[PDB]
């Protein structure tokens, strides 16, 4: 879906509708804290709207927006168009970004930073909205087909007539109740998103591609836009319950992957081109290290980078990881100083490390973040 940097456009309509829908379907026996948090959420509507359109204008966006894609069947963005990386990486997809930003959103909310929290939730919904288009889950880029942009423009112009005001049931009913059943946010979000993405991919082949009429496009937009609104409303519902009761999805679960969200200082020369590594040390003195290298230029001055690391051992708990750090090693003969501003480490949908740094890492040195 289209979206403008000022927080207007199809993307903004989906989240704005998502809140109204929720308000409409909210059952009377819904907890009081949920009602209050929704009021705080409506108070911050413009940040939800800005976050919903922001990823397309984010200056450190991938050249092709690879991560805005995800095939629910193959489980990747364009087969491996990021340009798949073995032994170190973990390419981001629309699906993983929903999880990343969802974790950031709950974290900020829990500390009363509603402004930042809502912006993050907004970004998470941008990615869900995308996977609910016909083209994104089918992995059909703008380069691959002219119908891609054309379809999103068709939708943008008619967005007003595709708004829905309810999912068709109250929150105490099946659709919403199901959302709350699985405490493992991550396992849930993946399946929930898969269902909508499969419907979008089907719609592409049966109605939204360039082989179809314009009465077909109307039907395709009506269905996928309705589903986008419906699914967003559910995500918001889940969010409100999670932030209101302080539900934690990481509990007891093994840590199979770690996600690092790094903000590089905006100061002159803060970015670097040297080899960067992220490492962990376990209580038992066992260590693992991965090279941080997604890319197209990582660690640019003022950028925000995401890395996902898969752990070797699969029986570890969060408390088992004694230390974590970042280490830099020179590329050429002269070290390239690096100045990170902050680093957050996410495990099982929970921000486990929120570390401000704001200092140079001049040469070949290690810097503990935990
Ligand atoms: Zn979009």
From Swiss-Prot:
Vaccination of mice with a fragment (residues 275-398) protects them against a subsequent challenge with purified alpha-toxin. Changing residue 269 to N: Increased dependence of PLC on Ca(2+). Dramatically decreases hemolytic, cytotoxic and myotoxic activities. Ca(2+) 2 binds at residues 293-294, 296, 298. Its cofactor is Ca(2+); Zn(2+). GO terms for molecular function: calcium-dependent phospholipase C activity; phosphatidylcholine phospholipase C activity; toxin activity; zinc ion binding. It is found in: Secreted. Residues 247-255 are annotated as: Linker. Changing residue 69 to C: Loss of all enzyme activities. Changing residue 15 to A: In strain: NCIB 10691. Keywords: Calcium, Cytolysis, Hemolysis, Hydrolase, Metal-binding, Secreted, Signal, Toxin, Virulence, Zinc. Changing residue 126 to G/S: Loss of all enzyme activities. Changing residue 63 to N: In strain: KZ1340. Residues 256-370 form the PLAT domain. Changing residue 68 to G/S: Loss of all enzyme activities. It catalyses: a 1,2-diacyl-sn-glycero-3-phosphocholine + H2O = phosphocholine + a 1,2-diacyl-sn-glycerol + H(+). PROSITE patterns: PLAT, PROKAR_ZN_DEPEND_PLPC_1, PROKAR_ZN_DEPEND_PLPC_2. GO terms for biological process: killing of cells of another organism. Its EC number is 3.1.4.3. Bacterial hemolysins are exotoxins that attack blood cell membranes and cause cell rupture. Constitutes an essential virulence factor in gas gangrene. Binds to eukaryotic membranes where it hydrolyzes both phosphatidylcholine and sphingomyelin. The diacylglycerol produced can activate both the arachidonic acid pathway, leading to modulation of the inflammatory response cascade and thrombosis, and protein kinase C, leading to activation of eukaryotic phospholipases and further membrane damage. Acts on human and mouse erythrocytes, but not on rabbit or horse erythrocytes. The protein is composed of 2 domains; the N-terminal domain contains the phospholipase C active site (PLC), in a cleft which is also occupied by the 3 zinc ions. The C-terminal domain is a putative phospholipid-recognition domain, which shows structural homology with phospholipid-binding C2-like domains from a range of eukaryotic proteins. The ability to bind membrane phospholipids in a Ca(2+) dependent manner and toxicity is conferred by this C-terminal domain, which also contributes to the sphingomyelinase activity. This is Phospholipase C.
């Amino acid at each position: 879906w289209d979206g403008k940097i000022d927080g207007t456009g199809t993307h903004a309509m989906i989240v704005t509708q998502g809140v109204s829908i929720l308000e409409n379907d909210l059952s009377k026996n819904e907890p009081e804290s949920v009602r209050k948090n929704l009021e705080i959420l409506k108070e911050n509507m413009h940040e939800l709207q800005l976050g919903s359109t922001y990823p397309d204008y984010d200056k450190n966006a991938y050249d092709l927006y690879q991560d805005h894609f995800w095939d629910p069947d193959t489980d990747n963005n364009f087969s491996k168009d990021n340009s798949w990386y073995l032994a170190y990486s973990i390419p981001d997809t629309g699906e993983s970004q929903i999880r990343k930003f969802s974790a950031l959103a709950r974290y900020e909310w829990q500390r009363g930073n509603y402004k930042q929290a809502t912006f993050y939730l907004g970004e998470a919904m941008h990615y869900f909205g995308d996977i609910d288009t016909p083209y994104h889950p089918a992995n059909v880029t703008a380069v691959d087909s002219a119908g891609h942009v054309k379809f999103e423009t068709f939708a943008e112009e008619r967005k007003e007539q595709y708004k829905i005001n309810t999912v068709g049931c109250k929150t105490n009913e099946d659709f919403y109740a199901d959302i709350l059943k699985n405490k493992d946010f991550n396992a849930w979000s993946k399946e929930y998103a898969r269902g909508f993405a499969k419907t979008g991919k089907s719609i592409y082949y049966s109605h939204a591609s360039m082989s179809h009429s314009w009465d077909d496009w109307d039907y395709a937009a009506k269905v996928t836009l309705a589903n986008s609104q419906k699914g967003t409303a559910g995500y918001i519902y889940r969010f409100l319950h999670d932030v209101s009761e302080g539900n934690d999805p990481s509990v007891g679960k093994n840590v199979k992957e770690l996600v690092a969200y790094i903000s590089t200082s905006g100061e002159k020369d803060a970015g670097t081109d040297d080899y960067m590594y992220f490492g962990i040390k376990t209580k038992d003195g066992k260590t693992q290290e991965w090279e941080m290298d997604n890319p197209g230029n990582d660690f640019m001055t003022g950028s925000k980078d995401t890395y996902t690391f898969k752990l070797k051992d699969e029986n570890l708990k969060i408390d088992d990881i004694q230390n974590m750090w970042i280490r830099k090693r020179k590329y050429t003969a002269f070290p390239d100083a690096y100045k990170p501003e902050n680093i957050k480490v996410i495990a099982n949908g929970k921000v486990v490390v929120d570390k401000d740094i704001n200092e140079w890492i001049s040469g070949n040195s290690t810097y503990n973040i935990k």
